Design a protein around this ligand. Structure first.
Ligand code: VW3
Lengths: 300, 237
């Protein structure tokens, strides 16, 4: 189990760690989060009590270094940093644990939610979507735009998701216009899976990362990406059977975890009704269709 | 954006544009089978592609053989239309290609956009106008060439005959749509109006009769009457 210590908490803030969250008061004696499960990526995220504008946070993998949080009063945010002195770090964490100044990552033993939401998400791929190579961890916030959003303005601060566009020469083979537009299997299997992503695990990883950025930061561009990757599969007549089964599990856990009160902005009616009721795969997402119908029957 | 009452004069500026109407592309007769079921039999159709400034009508005849062995024909017809319009544009010199293509039915937007991806600078636009181009097959010479075709064929007509020697393209288009609206609302009456006087003939390269300016005003008046009437006869007013 790993630890992300905090130097201090000078401003009142709601802190999230994965799907958990807690409130820290201004100058409360808070020194971080312990017992973080090893083997998964994680996200630690923040919403200031005084400015609900800008949710922001950091994707990280404790196997890649010793990371801590320190508020910066000039830039006005909690910043993740790497501590290179391993003996300094262990000594800091041990003192904070002995004084019991840390919250415990509060995983229930039965609970596979976080694994199920991040199964295919890798830190190395996150770092290619979020480019800042001098750090091992990746900052995301509510306002960051995607490369595709920029095409339609600071590139350093962009989300470089794979561009998907159903009315594009990449998506449509000359002479197969109608075929490729109504059945996107070519674009899914040859262009995207074989060509760009290499395998379905990398595809699912980006799909999962996009959902999580939409959910945790209300990042609109990420929501667009999540829906596009779903729609590309559902609009393909020819999808490997193992991918459909896995997609159903992926989406089931995303819909299960979504805040009930955010469904109106985070779920696109057109995509979901098309995917569950009109698309080639309308009959292939049994778990997802059941949870959607029982939890958001209004959207449909 | 969409073409409507407010931006109507844009049709007659000097930016090349084409209207595309797909109504008459896939045409059928519905009939009973010996077993008493219902079947369709396709008949020849046409794409109606019109330059509203010049009257240039590129009439692509759709022969029934293009439907053989195909499913979902109403959907295929929109993609066939887009394929042929794309082929037409590519066949024109660069300086003759349109800067905009206006489709008369919104369901043509995605088919045409996808076929024209090679032409990102050609705007594909819908319209809110309820244009009467479906009545093109009520023009005898156009109907005749479509029904006689034995293979795919493109036939060229000026839909304005020689009118542009005497009137502007705004006026010519208004006359065209009045004639076609009338033919759509009551074909028999419209055709009676146009031919009642045997001394006025249709030139061999023309589609409509050789009315003088004064006779066109009368003709145009009679077409308005017809349309207002049928609107009463229809709604009882
Ligand atoms: O004879 C002409 C000029 C060429 O007319 C057309 C007609 C249809 C398509 C292309 C050109 N004016 O009457």
């Amino acid at each position: 189990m790993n630890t992300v210590p905090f130097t201090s908490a000078p401003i009142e803030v709601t802190i999230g760690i994965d799907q958990y969250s807690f409130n820290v008061k201004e100058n409360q004696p808070f020194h971080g989060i312990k017992d973080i499960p090893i083997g998964h990526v994680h996200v630690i995220h923040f919403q200031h009590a005084d400015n609900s504008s800008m949710r922001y946070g950091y994707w990280f993998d404790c196997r890649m270094g010793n990371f801590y949080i320190q508020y910066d009063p000039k830039d006005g945010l909690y910043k993740m940093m790497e501590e290179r002195d391993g003996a300094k770090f262990e000594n800091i964490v041990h003192n904070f644990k002995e004084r019991q100044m840390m919250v415990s990552y509060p995983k229930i033993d039965e609970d596979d939610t976080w694994y199920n939401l991040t199964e295919f998400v890798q830190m190395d791929k996150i770092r290619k979507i979020v480019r800042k190579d001098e750090n091992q961890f990746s900052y995301v916030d509510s306002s960051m735009t995607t490369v595709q959003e920029n095409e339609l303005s600071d590139p350093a601060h962009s989300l470089n998701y794979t561009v998907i566009n159903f009315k594009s020469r990449e998506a449509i083979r000359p002479g197969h216009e109608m075929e490729d537009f109504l059945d996107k299997s070519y674009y899914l299997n040859t262009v995207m899976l074989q060509g760009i992503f290499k395998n379905s695990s990398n595809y699912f990883g980006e799909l999962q990362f996009a959902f999580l950025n939409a959910m945790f930061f209300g990042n609109y561009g990420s929501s667009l990406q999540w829906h596009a990757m779903i729609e590309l599969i559902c609009s393909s007549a020819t999808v490997p059977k193992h991918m459909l089964d896995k997609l159903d599990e992926i989406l089931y856990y995303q819909i299960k975890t979504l805040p009930e009160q955010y469904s109106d902005i985070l779920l696109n009616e057109r995509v979901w009704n098309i995917c569950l009721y009109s698309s080639f795969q309308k009959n292939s997402l049994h778990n997802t269709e059941k949870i959607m119908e029982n939890k958001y029957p209004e959207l449909l | 954006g969409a073409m409507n009452s407010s931006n109507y004069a844009e049709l007659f500026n000097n930016d090349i544009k084409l209207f595309v109407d797909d109504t008459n592309v896939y045409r059928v007769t519905v009939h009973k089978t010996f077993e008493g079921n219902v079947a369709t039999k396709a008949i020849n159709g046409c794409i109606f592609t019109l330059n509203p400034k010049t009257g240039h009508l590129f009439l692509k005849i759709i022969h029934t053989s293009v439907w053989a062995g195909q499913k979902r024909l109403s959907q295929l017809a929109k993609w066939k239309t887009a394929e042929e319009v794309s082929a037409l544009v590519r066949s024109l010199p660069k300086e003759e290609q349109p800067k905009q293509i206006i489709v008369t039915r919104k369901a043509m937007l995605d088919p045409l956009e996808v076929h024209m991806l090679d032409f990102p600078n050609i705007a594909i636009r819908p319209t809110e106008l309820r244009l009467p181009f479906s009545a093109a097959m009520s023009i005898d010479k156009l109907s005749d060439v479509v029904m006689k075709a034995t293979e795919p064929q493109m036939v060229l007509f000026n839909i304005y005959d020689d009118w542009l020697d005497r009137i502007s393209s705004y006026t010519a288009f208004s006359r065209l749509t009045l004639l076609l609206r009338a033919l759509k609302t009551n074909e028999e009456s419209a055709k009676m109006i146009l031919l009642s006087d045997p001394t006025i003939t249709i030139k061999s390269y023309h589609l409509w009769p050789s009315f003088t300016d004064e006779q066109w005003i009368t003709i145009e008046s009679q077409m308005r009457d017809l349309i207002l009437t049928e609107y009463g006869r229809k709604y009882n007013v």
